[PDB]
Amino acid sequence: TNVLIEDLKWRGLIYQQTDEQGIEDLLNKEQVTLYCGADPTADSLHIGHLLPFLTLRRFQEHGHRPIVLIGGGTGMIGDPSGKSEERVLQTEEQVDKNIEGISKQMHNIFEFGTDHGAVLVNNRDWLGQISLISFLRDYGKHVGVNYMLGKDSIQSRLEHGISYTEFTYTILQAIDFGHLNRELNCKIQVGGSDQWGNITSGIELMRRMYGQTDAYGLTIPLVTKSDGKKFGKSESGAVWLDAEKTSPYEFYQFWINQSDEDVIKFLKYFTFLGKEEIDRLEQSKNEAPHLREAQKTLAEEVTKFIHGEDALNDAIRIS
């Protein structure tokens, strides 16, 4: 008992939390249904999107039920979290195709189709049925302009030009939690630091709309390189999870090129090894460095999980 929460802590997968007791107690006392979402604004994800999802798997292992949410509806708008300029809105077509690429990739990381395992939902399924008058009276009435204002993620765009569309996004992600909380009994939402605004926007709606249903929110750290240069984007560009964009070999290199300063942490972040296994690697790392042992294992271990062992080999095959 208390094993999962301890692991997430040892590996450092936790940054922010709405209620630390409530969560610990919940994660101990029962089986949680939690969810993380992705707006389809690319037909592929890059390594910068992996940690939060990988982390839903971790929750699954201990017997919880994950929800991968795909934003058909919200991806039509644009999430302004962490932004400076207007996210130009794309066509009902570009979304439709992106959603096709991304949805594919979630299927390689989770096992959909079981009777009670991982679920994959699309928010357009419910936001597409809600109207302007229906929205303003059923949900909008329960959101305060003062709460929304001052919210961290708004100031950024507040000083420049935040449209009503871009401004109205959180309420859109606040209804998803409420819906999902209601229909699939979703009690926790995981996301990265940028989502802290939209996560809490949701717990509060639920609270005012109808007594918060043991709903909680927690965030995952920002993958930081030791030299402060942004992780994931080299120069050629982002390291995509699609072989047609970043070959498994190019994908395998990225990893092996990791610095000793952050190789072990990357190991705790992206691989399902184990304390003594990871400590095994730590010792050899800081003792026979020329062996690049820890980089080697991370590379292989994360390339198997994404491109199958069969490409992992074709991740060394060319010379």
Ligand X SMILES: CCCCOC(=O)[C@@H](NC(=O)[C@@H](N)Cc1ccc(O)cc1)[C@H]1[C@H](O)[C@](O)(CO)[C@@H](O)CN1O
* Interacting residues with its own copies (CB under 8 A): 15-16, 18-22, 84-85, 146-147, 150-152, 155-157, 159-160, 196-197, 199-201, 203-204, 221-222, 224, 226-230, 233, 235, 261, 264-265, 286
- Nearer to ligand X among residue 49 and residue 285 (C-beta): 49
Burial class (CB in 10 A: 0-12, 13-18, 19+), 175: buried
Q: Which of its own copies, ligand X, none does residue 64 bind to, with CB < 5 to 8 Å depending on kind?
A: none
Determine, following the binding rule CB under 6 A, whether residue 71 of this chain makes contact with ligand X: yes
Query: In the complex, what is the shortest distance from the CB of residue 21 to its own copies, in angstroms, rounded to a whole number?
Result: 7
- Nearer to ligand X among residue 32 and residue 180 (C-beta): 180
- Pairwise CA distance, residues 2 & 292, whole Å: 34
Query: In the complex, what is the shortest distance from the CB of residue 190 to ligand X, in angstroms, rounded to a whole number?
Result: 8
- State the binding string over 83-112 for ligand X (x if CB under 6 A, else -): -------------------x----------
Q: Which of ligand X, its own copies, none does residue 18 bind to, with CB < 5 to 8 Å depending on kind?
A: its own copies
Site size toward ligand X (CB under 6 A) is 23
Query: In the complex, what is the shortest distance from the CB of residue 125 to its own copies, in angstroms, rounded to a whole number?
Result: 26
* The three-state (H, E, C) secondary structure of the chain, written as one string: CCHHHHHHHHHCCCCCECCHHHHHHHHHHCCCEEEEEECCCCCCCEHHHHHHHHHHHHHHHCCCEEEEEECCCHHHCCCCCCCCCCCCCCCHHHHHHHHHHHHHHHHHHCCECCCCCEEEEECHHHHCCCCHHHHHHHCHHHCCHHHHCCCHHHHHHHCCCCCHHHHHHHHHHHHHHHHHHHHCCCCEEEEEHHHHHHHHHHHHHHHHHCCCCCCEEEEECCCCCCCCCCCCECCCCECECCCCCCCHHHHHHHHHCCCHHHHHHHHHHHCCCCHHHHHHHHHHHCCCHHHCHHHHHHHHHHHHHHHHHHHHHHHCCCC
Q: Which of its own copies, ligand X, none does residue 166 bind to, with CB < 5 to 8 Å depending on kind?
A: none
Q: Which of its own copies, ligand X, none does residue 173 bind to, with CB < 5 to 8 Å depending on kind?
A: ligand X
Query: In the complex, what is the shortest distance from the CB of residue 18 to its own copies, in angstroms, rounded to a whole number?
Result: 5
Query: In the complex, what is the shortest distance from the CB of residue 158 to its own copies, in angstroms, rounded to a whole number?
Result: 8
- State the binding string over 187-206 for ligand X (x if CB under 6 A, else -): ----xx-xx--x--------
Q: Do the beta carbons of residue 31 and residue 63 sit within 8 Å?
A: yes
Query: In the complex, what is the shortest distance from the CB of residue 267 to its own copies, in angstroms, rounded to a whole number?
Result: 12
Task: Identify residues 35-54 at the interface with ligand X (CB under 6 A).
Answer: 36-39, 41-42, 45, 48-49, 52
What is the binding site for ligand X (CB under 6 A)? 36-39, 41-42, 45, 48-49, 52, 69, 71, 74, 79, 102, 123, 173, 176, 191-192, 194-195, 198
